[PDB]
Amino acid sequence: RAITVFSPDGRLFQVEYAREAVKKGSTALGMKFANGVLLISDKKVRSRLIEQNSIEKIQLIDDYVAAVTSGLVADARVLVDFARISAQQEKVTYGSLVNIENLVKRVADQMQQYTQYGGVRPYGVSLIFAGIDQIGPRLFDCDPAGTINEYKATAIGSGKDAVVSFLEREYKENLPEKEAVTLGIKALKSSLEEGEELKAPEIASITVGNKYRIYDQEEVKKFL
Amino acid sequence: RAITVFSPDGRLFQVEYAREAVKKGSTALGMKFANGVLLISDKKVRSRLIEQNSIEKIQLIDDYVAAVTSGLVADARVLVDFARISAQQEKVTYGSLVNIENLVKRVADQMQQYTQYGGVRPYGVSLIFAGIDQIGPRLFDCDPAGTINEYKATAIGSGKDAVVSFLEREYKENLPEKEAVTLGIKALKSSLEEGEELKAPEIASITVGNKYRIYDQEEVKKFL
Amino acid sequence: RAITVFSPDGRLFQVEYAREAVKKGSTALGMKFANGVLLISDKKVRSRLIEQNSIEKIQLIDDYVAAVTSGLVADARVLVDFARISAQQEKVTYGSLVNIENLVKRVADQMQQYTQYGGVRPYGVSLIFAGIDQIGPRLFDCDPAGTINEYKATAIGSGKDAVVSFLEREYKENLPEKEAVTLGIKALKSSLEEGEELKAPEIASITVGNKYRIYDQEEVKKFL
Amino acid sequence: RAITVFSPDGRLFQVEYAREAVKKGSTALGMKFANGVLLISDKKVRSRLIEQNSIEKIQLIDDYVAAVTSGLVADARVLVDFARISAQQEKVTYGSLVNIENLVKRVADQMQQYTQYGGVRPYGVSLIFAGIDQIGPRLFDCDPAGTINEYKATAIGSGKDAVVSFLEREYKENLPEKEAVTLGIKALKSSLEEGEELKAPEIASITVGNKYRIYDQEEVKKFL
Amino acid sequence: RAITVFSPDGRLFQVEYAREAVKKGSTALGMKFANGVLLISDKKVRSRLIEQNSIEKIQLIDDYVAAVTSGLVADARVLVDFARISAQQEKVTYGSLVNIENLVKRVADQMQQYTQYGGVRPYGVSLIFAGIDQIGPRLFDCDPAGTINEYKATAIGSGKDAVVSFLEREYKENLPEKEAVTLGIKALKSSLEEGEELKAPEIASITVGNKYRIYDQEEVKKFL
Amino acid sequence: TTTVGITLKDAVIMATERRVTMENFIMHKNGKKLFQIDTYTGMTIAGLVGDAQVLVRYMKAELELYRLQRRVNMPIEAVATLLSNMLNQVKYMPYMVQLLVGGIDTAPHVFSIDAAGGSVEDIYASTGSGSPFVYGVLESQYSEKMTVDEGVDLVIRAISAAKQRDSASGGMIDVAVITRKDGYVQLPTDQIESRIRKLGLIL
Amino acid sequence: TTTVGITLKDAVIMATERRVTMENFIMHKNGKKLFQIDTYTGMTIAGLVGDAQVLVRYMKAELELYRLQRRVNMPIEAVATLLSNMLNQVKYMPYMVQLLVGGIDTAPHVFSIDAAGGSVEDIYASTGSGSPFVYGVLESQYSEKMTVDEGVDLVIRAISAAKQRDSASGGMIDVAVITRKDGYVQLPTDQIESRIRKLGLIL
Amino acid sequence: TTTVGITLKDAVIMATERRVTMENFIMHKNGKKLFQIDTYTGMTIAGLVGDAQVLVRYMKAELELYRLQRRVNMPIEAVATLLSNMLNQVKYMPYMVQLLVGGIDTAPHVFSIDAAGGSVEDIYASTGSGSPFVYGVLESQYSEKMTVDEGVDLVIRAISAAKQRDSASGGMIDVAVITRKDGYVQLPTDQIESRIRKLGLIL
Amino acid sequence: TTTVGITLKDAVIMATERRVTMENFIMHKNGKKLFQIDTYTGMTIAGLVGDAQVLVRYMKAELELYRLQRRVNMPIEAVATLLSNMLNQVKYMPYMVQLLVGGIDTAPHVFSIDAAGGSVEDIYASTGSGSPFVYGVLESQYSEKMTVDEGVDLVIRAISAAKQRDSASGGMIDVAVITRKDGYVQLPTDQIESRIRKLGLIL
């Protein structure tokens, strides 16, 4: 088979193959607004026996930082839990989480190790972290190789490319919360509206000076 | 041979092959009712020298949570025992098991590790956990990759697809206990009635405000 | 070569190949009677320089539980010794061995590990445990994958199939000790009487309320 | 595949393949001036949703030493963090960082290990360290095999060759700060101006007797 | 690929391939004189941006012992540092370094291990140690397999053979310091003068009763 | 603290006073010291608060696990033996705890486990700082020909006696009778107060 | 130090004096000892500064983590039980800390955890060096028929009493009422001073 | 030793006497005890020489690392909290050190960390063997309506007072004012001597 | 033992008496306590024989290693700082050693490191059992306007003084002056005896 070792063309094929795996996930996206950031995910719901709301793909890490994930579900869970405890570690050491940049890096390092070492495949998941720290609103992306990039808007999963182009053209940097989620849902629409359906996305927002607010079923459909 | 490492198409074939192994098991299913949840399994009984009742495939984890398993029998045992002790750990730490969601996640993480690491094949078994916690009745599913999904009704094993479709059409969310087990047995019937036999399933139910009740031979045949 | 990792058809070939190895052993069988259980083994004796009686294949684990084994002789010894010490552990912890079911499971778990992990082939041996605990007479079987099944009568080794069919037809659940060993020897006969010989089997029985009694040479030939 | 083990022609192909990977990075370069050293990097910015300034590829190790990196981004991060802590170790042991040569060697040794040992691919990144120590201005280079060379000017990444030749001809050893950054930008131009664009590089300088000064957006465009 | 394990013709090919790697290095040589020993190396200088003097390939281990190395630069560094600390260990244990033979053996043993064990390629570097101990002037050689030989004059690297033959004919055992370095430079000339250039070598000498003296740029050119 | 376990016929009763102290200075006028530890066994605490709780949480979980794996309740002599082994293994950073565990598995029992893991079964036993006092009255008035009703009343008398002569003991007595027939059942406060008044231990 | 927790109806109030000491010699005339530890539970400190802070940072993080994973607040009896277990496990390099934690999950509670991990719930409890004093006045004037207003005023009286007779206690009282209806809300200094003056504990 | 930190408006000043001892027998007539630990925070030492230095080297490096990774200075409450955690973790082979750290991040602060990792912020605080003395004069003459100039002069008065009545303290006072506007700036010896003479604390 | 280090201009001088004891009972009438530890730094020992030697062998090797890797001599403040860190890390199985290290890197220095790793630089310092005595005479007769010759003579006076009043000190004084210009040079016995006689400290 193959392992993380460099190919003759300078590529870590296991990482490449990892990246393929995130592409086969469910789309989710996010972007900053005037004074906060929002995360809005597609809901991999198709069965009616699935418990709707209970399956949350926007998960909180700490009251003021959430992450929405894409990729292999299982690896996403564990890695999400890694992040939670790492946040808590900073709270117990330093008193507070003063930089979300840090939080995302530590988690990144974890993934970079499994991409360095043999006897272990890479972590095949992608995630974006958003939240507000002392610096202000931050939107970060995390890749299977451990790569981190800081965004204003970014996407992940199946509608990665699709959503990317939408955002690439139509994103306005300071936009009020309302208009912003709408823009999101339009971008998510274009993409995911290739089955000619979208249903209701799961939507969360945070604004400076407060905690994360995860919306309810009824609200979302109004912006839908 | 092969190991958990990503294939060129973004799949962990060892996990895929794991999933094949659960498909070759014995069918079992479950669903929530008005105020509880039920687990009902097919009984892999064909020899008359097998000790009937003694072989239980619905096993209790704690007085108020059971799990019924499908897959390789051996791996199911060990993993079931992992779950038992993990439940006990929460009892000794926190005082009580306040979320079955947690209990199922921890066990999930265990499976996710053996799906991450080399020098170790994945755990090839599937299970569904049901019980009532502080939140209320919960039905959870667990897969070889560590994947967890929350249900109202779900199935596993050979009659996975079969039972799934039955439930997909004919499931009514609030149903009284009685009607519910009947629906179960009808769903289990359609499927498993391809040998033109079914014999007596093993049936358990829990209702809010009490402990798990595992039925007896004589009862079951009345709903049969 | 091959290792325990799942094949494309959902099978652990190393385990399969293990099972082949038990099939190439010496036959042994057991069954419960009115108030006890018996174990009766074929004796792999062909040389006259072999010390007859001294080679015991029904070995005691504890005064009130024996196990008779089939497979690779060497692995059977070690695993038998694992069981002995595990019994002793329960005696030192709890005061008594209150369930033979437990005793057999722990030993099962051991085998399941060597079937999980690489860097280690499975344990290629089969055994049946019999004894009386607080619950009453118990007959258990143990397989290379760690699988355990509870019997009324069961067989192992070369005459596995042969003996199985015999028992499948002619087994009566409550039978007096005497008639029982006779039934055993008849079942062992049909099978092993394909070389047109059988010699004298080694026979042990336990009855509720007492210890294991291993018969002597002279006795056995009377039931022969 | 392949591992660090010597080929029949005396080469560690994994290291060779590592070096290929650095070549596929983003260009960055540096050179000493009259009384300091400068680091100036190309900015891998193409999306407008990327947070410009926030992504820094010239990162500080200590107030008086920076490193700008090229290669796999992920491995660069971790290795950069290795260097930071190693600097801090010297501060806590000795009182001060008296030689940047040392600092760069320790980090080099780290890379040399992953190039020695199996069960681990090499670290596929290149970096140049610059700063002023007790000895004076120092510019160092670091390669995937752990190799270190001391420069007056050096380059890395895609425009490695390109920038190298530019510098090889037109570098004057004592040059005032101003003229120096200009020379840099000209060298970076020739190279990177093959897409017929360059945008604004990120520029840092240190002078003897003070700390590192990272320039701002507005300044750079004046030398642009 | 290949590992240190013996080939069918009694050779450790990984070691052989190691030796190839030292052959692809830069030439360096040494020889004893009347009352001391000298080490003189070719300088792998071709770029004008390289910091000349700063790159030293004759490195001191202790005030009274130097080593000049050939092979992979990276592995040479680490191994050189192994030697430094090992010297220091003897100083802290015994009070002094009474035999350079010892010092070179310990370092040899290190290389011999990486030539014994798997999970690790050999150390692909060669070095010669010279210095004066209680015994007197000593010149030692060290090979990738850990092999050590004691010389009067010896060579390493690309001009290994070339320089060897020169020395083989024209070496006179007691020669005054001056005449000696000249002989060196003549031997280094014949060889390395195949590009029709040599530039200035880096030259060091020690004499009994004193410390190592590393020459300066200006001196060397007089013997050049 | 003072706790009492009385074995009789086919039942065992166990009662405790409820009162923690925790300085001297009595800080809780209603602690818990009698704890159900299994559907057919309860265990009474009479040593040092912290330690004693930990043995309880442990024991709840450990018998619960057992019961699940073997599909049967653990014998009294077994939970006893097990508890001894637990205590004895870390007897050099020891629990300073005096534990009494009674229950009915096939006959009633009451085992007394000291701080060092010595468990000896007796037909009655007390533990705690008012230990001597209940031992007085029991040693005069215990008979193994007693029924549950007489049982509970002998218990009540004894514990009331302890309270009077020992200032560490005190606070509303609670009793549980554990029988095979009704399971483990803890008598409600109202039932107990009635019994005090009647026996004329009321003031 | 002295802290007080009073449970009543569907609220619990917790108040502390603010004053660290730290030699004898009172070095801080405004420490912090009452800390919110969850949206529905607060915890009061009354032992040794250092140690006590560490249990707080721990607890903030540990309930926060819990809440996130299970999507629900941790019960009081659970945070209590957990804290006991933490303390008991390293009771031979022990924290010398006396912790009181109250909160409202389904009913109000107030648990007192000693230094060795013994947790016993009571309807009121104090901790610290002025402990006896507030226990005096509470034991005379507590009624469980009190409303929040009467609650806060009983608290204030009690803590003022403690300050007078104990020289380790002192410094501006701060109180927090934690109810299900308004969440955890800590009363502002201005509200408290008004209440002193009124009750005529002002000088 | 005696050190003093005074918080006022938008500055904090910290001053120490310079004098180590190190037998009794005063061996250094010019030690260092006030140390800049970050561009916006300084920390004063008043315990045992060795130990105290190690916390300083640690802290310099640890805030420096932080600042680099996050691109921002660490908050005061954070460096405080962190230092507490460090001390508390090895409090059984403890540092016998009394640390005061002040700095300005968004408002001024001055935290006092004891040997066991208890950190409580106050508006002024001293540490060391002449601790009581500066606390005397501060408690009479501190006002939070003071400007830097008045600040430095209150500091100087206080430390001069300490020297007179405590023979462990002594030696040329050095003061640093840390403000947001000028950064951390340590006042040169010449500036300080002038201020002594003026205040008439000269002899 | 008594050792002395005097910093002046662009030199530092360090002298020791040579005499070990080792019972009381003076067993060596010529030990070694002043040791060159680098080409531009020497270090004087004044504690307990064994321990003290080990710090010396360590230090010789550690500065030698440094010098080789970085191609430059280690600064004084660095060797000092390093030595502190070494001592402080195993301060609970501590060296009972009092170390003085002086040398010239860019200016002269003399650091005094105690047993617990506290290093404070001063312009002169002594260590050892005759410590007070040389501190007496230095404190009267030291001036930083002294040249080497006056330097060596002030040293000699001081150490002779120590010998007279302290019976643990004694034995032929040896001095080394370390300057940038001549390197580290240890004055030969003949040079020193001449200087005794002249200063009239001869008998």
Coordinates of C-alpha atoms in Angstrom, one line a residue, chain F:
Chain F
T1 CA -20.9 7.9 65.0
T2 CA -22.4 4.7 65.9
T3 CA -24.0 2.1 63.6
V4 CA -25.6 -1.2 64.5
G5 CA -26.2 -4.5 62.5
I6 CA -28.4 -7.3 64.0
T7 CA -28.9 -10.5 62.2
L8 CA -32.0 -12.6 63.2
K9 CA -33.9 -15.5 61.5
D10 CA -34.1 -14.5 57.8
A11 CA -33.4 -10.7 58.0
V12 CA -30.8 -8.3 59.1
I13 CA -31.4 -4.8 60.2
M14 CA -29.0 -2.0 60.2
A15 CA -29.4 1.4 61.7
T16 CA -27.3 4.3 62.2
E17 CA -27.6 7.7 63.8
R18 CA -27.3 10.7 61.4
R19 CA -24.9 13.2 62.5
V20 CA -21.5 14.2 61.1
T21 CA -18.6 15.9 63.1
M22 CA -16.2 17.3 61.3
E23 CA -14.6 19.5 64.0
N24 CA -16.3 19.1 67.5
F25 CA -18.6 21.3 66.6
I26 CA -21.1 19.1 65.0
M27 CA -21.5 20.4 61.6
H28 CA -24.2 18.1 60.0
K29 CA -27.2 17.2 62.0
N30 CA -28.3 14.7 59.2
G31 CA -25.4 12.9 57.5
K32 CA -25.7 9.6 55.8
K33 CA -23.9 6.6 57.0
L34 CA -26.2 3.7 56.1
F35 CA -26.1 3.2 52.3
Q36 CA -27.6 0.5 50.1
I37 CA -24.8 -1.2 48.3
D38 CA -26.6 -3.8 46.4
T39 CA -30.3 -5.0 46.1
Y40 CA -29.6 -7.5 49.0
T41 CA -26.9 -5.8 51.0
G42 CA -26.4 -2.4 52.6
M43 CA -23.3 -1.1 54.4
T44 CA -22.8 1.2 57.3
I45 CA -19.9 3.7 57.8
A46 CA -18.3 4.7 61.0
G47 CA -15.0 6.3 60.6
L48 CA -13.7 9.2 58.8
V49 CA -16.1 11.0 56.3
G50 CA -14.0 11.3 53.2
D51 CA -12.4 7.9 53.1
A52 CA -15.6 6.2 54.0
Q53 CA -17.5 7.7 51.1
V54 CA -14.9 6.6 48.6
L55 CA -15.3 2.9 49.8
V56 CA -19.0 3.3 49.2
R57 CA -18.9 4.7 45.6
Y58 CA -16.3 2.0 44.9
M59 CA -18.5 -0.8 46.4
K60 CA -21.7 0.4 44.6
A61 CA -19.9 0.3 41.3
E62 CA -17.9 -3.0 41.9
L63 CA -21.1 -5.1 43.0
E64 CA -23.0 -3.5 40.2
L65 CA -20.4 -4.6 37.7
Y66 CA -20.2 -8.1 39.2
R67 CA -24.0 -8.6 39.1
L68 CA -24.1 -7.6 35.4
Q69 CA -21.3 -10.0 34.3
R70 CA -22.3 -13.0 36.3
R71 CA -26.1 -12.2 36.1
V72 CA -26.4 -12.9 39.9
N73 CA -25.9 -10.9 43.2
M74 CA -22.5 -11.2 44.9
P75 CA -22.5 -13.1 48.2
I76 CA -22.1 -11.3 51.5
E77 CA -19.0 -13.3 52.4
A78 CA -17.7 -12.3 48.9
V79 CA -18.3 -8.5 49.2
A80 CA -16.8 -8.8 52.6
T81 CA -13.8 -10.6 51.5
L82 CA -13.3 -8.3 48.5
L83 CA -13.6 -5.1 50.9
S84 CA -11.0 -6.7 53.2
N85 CA -8.6 -7.3 50.3
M86 CA -9.1 -3.6 49.1
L87 CA -8.4 -2.1 52.5
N88 CA -5.5 -4.5 53.4
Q89 CA -3.7 -3.6 50.0
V90 CA -3.3 0.1 51.0
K91 CA -3.0 -0.2 54.7
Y92 CA 0.2 1.9 54.8
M93 CA -1.7 5.0 53.4
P94 CA -4.7 3.4 55.3
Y95 CA -8.3 4.3 55.3
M96 CA -9.3 5.0 58.9
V97 CA -12.6 3.5 58.5
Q98 CA -14.7 0.9 60.4
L99 CA -17.1 -0.7 58.0
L100 CA -20.0 -3.1 58.7
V101 CA -21.8 -4.7 55.9
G102 CA -24.8 -7.0 56.3
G103 CA -27.0 -8.6 53.7
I104 CA -28.9 -11.8 52.9
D105 CA -27.8 -14.1 50.3
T106 CA -28.8 -17.6 51.5
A107 CA -28.9 -16.9 55.3
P108 CA -28.3 -13.4 56.9
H109 CA -24.8 -12.2 57.8
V110 CA -23.2 -9.1 59.3
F111 CA -19.5 -8.8 58.9
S112 CA -17.3 -6.3 60.6
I113 CA -14.3 -5.0 58.6
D114 CA -11.8 -2.9 60.6
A115 CA -9.4 -0.5 59.0
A116 CA -6.7 -3.1 58.3
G117 CA -9.1 -5.5 56.4
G118 CA -9.9 -8.0 59.0
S119 CA -13.4 -9.4 58.5
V120 CA -15.0 -11.6 61.0
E121 CA -18.7 -12.4 61.0
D122 CA -20.7 -12.2 64.2
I123 CA -24.4 -12.4 64.9
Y124 CA -24.4 -8.6 65.8
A125 CA -22.0 -5.9 65.7
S126 CA -21.6 -2.2 66.1
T127 CA -19.0 0.2 65.0
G128 CA -18.1 3.7 65.8
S129 CA -17.5 6.0 68.8
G130 CA -20.7 5.0 70.6
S131 CA -19.8 1.3 69.9
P132 CA -19.5 0.1 73.5
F133 CA -23.0 1.4 74.5
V134 CA -25.1 -0.5 71.9
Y135 CA -22.9 -3.6 72.7
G136 CA -24.1 -3.2 76.3
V137 CA -27.7 -3.2 75.7
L138 CA -27.5 -5.8 72.9
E139 CA -25.4 -8.2 75.1
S140 CA -28.2 -7.9 77.7
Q141 CA -31.3 -8.0 75.5
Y142 CA -30.4 -9.8 72.2
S143 CA -32.0 -13.1 71.5
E144 CA -31.9 -14.8 68.1
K145 CA -35.5 -15.8 68.4
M146 CA -36.6 -12.3 67.7
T147 CA -38.8 -11.4 64.8
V148 CA -38.2 -8.1 62.6
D149 CA -40.5 -6.1 64.8
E150 CA -38.8 -6.9 68.0
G151 CA -35.6 -6.6 65.9
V152 CA -36.2 -2.9 65.0
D153 CA -37.3 -2.1 68.4
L154 CA -34.1 -3.7 70.0
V155 CA -32.2 -1.6 67.4
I156 CA -34.0 1.6 68.4
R157 CA -33.5 1.1 72.1
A158 CA -29.7 0.4 71.6
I159 CA -29.1 3.4 69.3
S160 CA -31.1 5.7 71.7
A161 CA -28.9 4.5 74.5
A162 CA -25.7 5.3 72.5
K163 CA -26.9 8.9 71.9
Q164 CA -27.4 9.5 75.5
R165 CA -24.1 8.4 76.7
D166 CA -22.0 9.6 73.7
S167 CA -21.8 13.0 72.5
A168 CA -20.4 12.2 69.1
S169 CA -23.5 10.2 68.3
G170 CA -26.8 11.8 68.0
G171 CA -29.4 12.9 65.5
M172 CA -32.5 11.1 63.9
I173 CA -32.0 7.4 63.8
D174 CA -32.6 5.6 60.5
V175 CA -33.0 1.9 60.1
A176 CA -33.3 -0.4 57.1
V177 CA -34.3 -4.0 57.2
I178 CA -33.0 -6.2 54.5
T179 CA -34.9 -9.4 54.0
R180 CA -35.1 -11.9 51.2
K181 CA -38.8 -11.6 50.9
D182 CA -39.2 -7.7 50.4
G183 CA -35.7 -7.0 49.3
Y184 CA -33.8 -4.2 51.0
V185 CA -36.3 -1.6 52.4
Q186 CA -35.5 1.4 54.4
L187 CA -38.1 2.3 56.9
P188 CA -39.5 5.9 56.4
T189 CA -38.8 8.6 59.1
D190 CA -42.6 8.5 60.1
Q191 CA -42.4 4.9 61.0
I192 CA -39.3 5.3 63.2
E193 CA -40.6 8.4 65.3
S194 CA -43.8 6.4 66.1
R195 CA -41.5 3.6 67.4
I196 CA -39.5 6.0 69.6
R197 CA -42.5 7.5 71.3
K198 CA -44.0 4.0 71.9
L199 CA -40.8 2.6 73.5
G200 CA -40.7 5.8 75.5
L201 CA -37.4 7.1 74.4
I202 CA -39.0 10.4 73.5
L203 CA -38.1 13.8 75.0

